[PDB]
């Protein structure tokens with residue numbers, strides 16, 4: 001009912017499960033690639049592996 | 051009816067490169 005007590009009202013649910021494997025990433029945030037660098041000391045990040 | 055498996059049926063357990071190692 002629209003006038004049930006809140007503990008007896010309907011609720012919608014979503015549950016997100018994240019597949020954090022060493023397989024290839026396919027769902028990623030608004031992050032942006034640089035050019036690659038070689039043979040020099042650098043800070044790096046690959047798919048979230050800092 | 052049957053036969054023996056010997057050492058068939060081992061598989062790469064995880065999606066990671068490892069080399070020259072006696073992993074467990």
Ligand SMILES: *[C@@H]1O[C@H](CO)[C@@H](O)[C@H](O)[C@H]1NC(C)=O
Pocket residue numbers: 052053054
């Ligand atoms: C397994 O196979 C051998 C013959 O290759 C037989 O002697 C033995 O009894 C068998 N054991 C089982 C549990 O099937």
